[PDB]
CSV table of C-alpha atoms in Angstrom, one decimal:
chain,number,residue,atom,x,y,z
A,1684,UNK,CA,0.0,0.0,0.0
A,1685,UNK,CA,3.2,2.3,0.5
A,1686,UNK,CA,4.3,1.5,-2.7
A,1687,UNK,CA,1.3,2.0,-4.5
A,1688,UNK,CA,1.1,5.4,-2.3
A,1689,UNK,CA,3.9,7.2,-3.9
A,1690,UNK,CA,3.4,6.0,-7.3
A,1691,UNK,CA,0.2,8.4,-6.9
A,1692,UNK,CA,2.9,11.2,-5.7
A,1693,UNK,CA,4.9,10.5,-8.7
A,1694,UNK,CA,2.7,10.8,-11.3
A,1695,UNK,CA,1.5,14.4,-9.4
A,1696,UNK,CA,4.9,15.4,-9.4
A,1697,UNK,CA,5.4,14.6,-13.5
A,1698,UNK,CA,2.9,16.4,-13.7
A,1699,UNK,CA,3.7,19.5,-12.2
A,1700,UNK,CA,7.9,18.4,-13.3
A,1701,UNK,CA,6.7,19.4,-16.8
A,1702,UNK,CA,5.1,22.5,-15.5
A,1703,UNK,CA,8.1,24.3,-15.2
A,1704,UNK,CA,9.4,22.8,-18.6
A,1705,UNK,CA,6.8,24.4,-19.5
A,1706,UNK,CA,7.6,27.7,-18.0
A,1707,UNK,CA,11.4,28.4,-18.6
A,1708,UNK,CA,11.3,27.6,-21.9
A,1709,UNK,CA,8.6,30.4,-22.6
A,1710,UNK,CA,11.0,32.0,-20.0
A,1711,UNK,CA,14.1,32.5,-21.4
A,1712,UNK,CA,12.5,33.3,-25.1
A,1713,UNK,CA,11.0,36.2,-22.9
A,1714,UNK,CA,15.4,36.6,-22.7
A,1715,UNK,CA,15.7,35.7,-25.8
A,1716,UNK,CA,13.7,38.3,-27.9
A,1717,UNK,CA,15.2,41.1,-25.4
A,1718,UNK,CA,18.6,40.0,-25.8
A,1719,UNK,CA,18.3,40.2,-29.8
A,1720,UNK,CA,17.0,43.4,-29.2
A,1721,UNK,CA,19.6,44.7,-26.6
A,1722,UNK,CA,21.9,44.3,-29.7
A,1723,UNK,CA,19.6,46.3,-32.3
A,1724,UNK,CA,19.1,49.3,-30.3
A,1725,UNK,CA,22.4,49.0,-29.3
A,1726,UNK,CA,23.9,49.1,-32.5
A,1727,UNK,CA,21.7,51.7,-33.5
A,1728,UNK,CA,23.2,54.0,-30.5
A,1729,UNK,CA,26.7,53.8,-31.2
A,1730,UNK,CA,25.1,54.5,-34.9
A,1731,UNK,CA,23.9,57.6,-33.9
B,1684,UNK,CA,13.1,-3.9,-2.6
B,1685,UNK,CA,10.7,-2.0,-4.7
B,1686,UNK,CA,9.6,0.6,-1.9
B,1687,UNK,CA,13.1,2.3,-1.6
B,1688,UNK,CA,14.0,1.6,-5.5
B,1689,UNK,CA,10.9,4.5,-6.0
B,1690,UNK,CA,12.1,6.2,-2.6
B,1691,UNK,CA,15.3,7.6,-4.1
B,1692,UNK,CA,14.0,8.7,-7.5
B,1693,UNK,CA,11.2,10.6,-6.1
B,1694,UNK,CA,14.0,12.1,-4.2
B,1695,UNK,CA,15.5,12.5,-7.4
B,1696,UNK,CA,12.5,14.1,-9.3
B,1697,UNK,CA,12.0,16.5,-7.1
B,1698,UNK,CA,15.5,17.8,-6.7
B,1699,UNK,CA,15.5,18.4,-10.6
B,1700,UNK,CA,12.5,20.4,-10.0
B,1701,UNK,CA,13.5,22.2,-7.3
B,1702,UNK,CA,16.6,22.9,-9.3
B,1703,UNK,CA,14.8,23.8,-12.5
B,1704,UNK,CA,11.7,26.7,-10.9
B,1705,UNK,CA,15.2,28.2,-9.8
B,1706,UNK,CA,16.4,28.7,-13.4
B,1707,UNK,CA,13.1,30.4,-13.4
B,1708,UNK,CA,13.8,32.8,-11.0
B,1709,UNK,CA,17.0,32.7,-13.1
B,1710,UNK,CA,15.8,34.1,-15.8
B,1711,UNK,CA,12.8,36.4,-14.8
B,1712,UNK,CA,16.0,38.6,-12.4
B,1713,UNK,CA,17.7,38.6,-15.5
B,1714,UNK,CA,14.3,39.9,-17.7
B,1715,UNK,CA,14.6,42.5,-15.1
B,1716,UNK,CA,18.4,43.4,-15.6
B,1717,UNK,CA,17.3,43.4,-19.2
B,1718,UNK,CA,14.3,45.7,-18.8
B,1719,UNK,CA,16.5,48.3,-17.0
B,1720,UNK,CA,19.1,48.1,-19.1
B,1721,UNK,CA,16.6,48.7,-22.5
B,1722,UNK,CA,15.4,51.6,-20.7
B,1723,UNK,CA,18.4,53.5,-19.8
B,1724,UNK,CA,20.3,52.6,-22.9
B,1725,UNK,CA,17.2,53.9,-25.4
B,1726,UNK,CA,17.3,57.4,-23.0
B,1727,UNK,CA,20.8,57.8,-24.9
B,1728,UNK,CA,19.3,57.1,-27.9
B,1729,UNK,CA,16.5,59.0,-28.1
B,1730,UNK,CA,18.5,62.0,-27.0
B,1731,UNK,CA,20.6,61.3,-29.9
């Protein structure tokens, strides 16, 4: 009964395991997208 | 045999996702050295 008891935990804890896979990778695009632009503007002030 | 074979991985899963919401926190600290940084590097540029 123990080991069918944290089989149950398990499978909760996949669950919210791919939560957070979930969340950085939609995390660091929010990076990502600012650090391609922390080069444009960048280069455009050096431009200027 | 079972009933510690699952003990350690749960002990396992978990410490991957109590490392992993921690890159999260990673990366939104860094979307707010990004955020400051697009703000006081456009004030040069606009001025320009």
């Amino acid at each position: 009964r123990r080991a069918n008891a944290l089989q149950n935990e398990l499978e909760e804890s996949r669950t919210l395991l791919e939560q957070a896979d979930r969340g950085r990778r939609q995390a660091e695009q929010e990076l990502g997208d600012a650090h391609e632009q922390i080069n444009e503007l960048a280069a455009q002030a050096t431009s200027a």
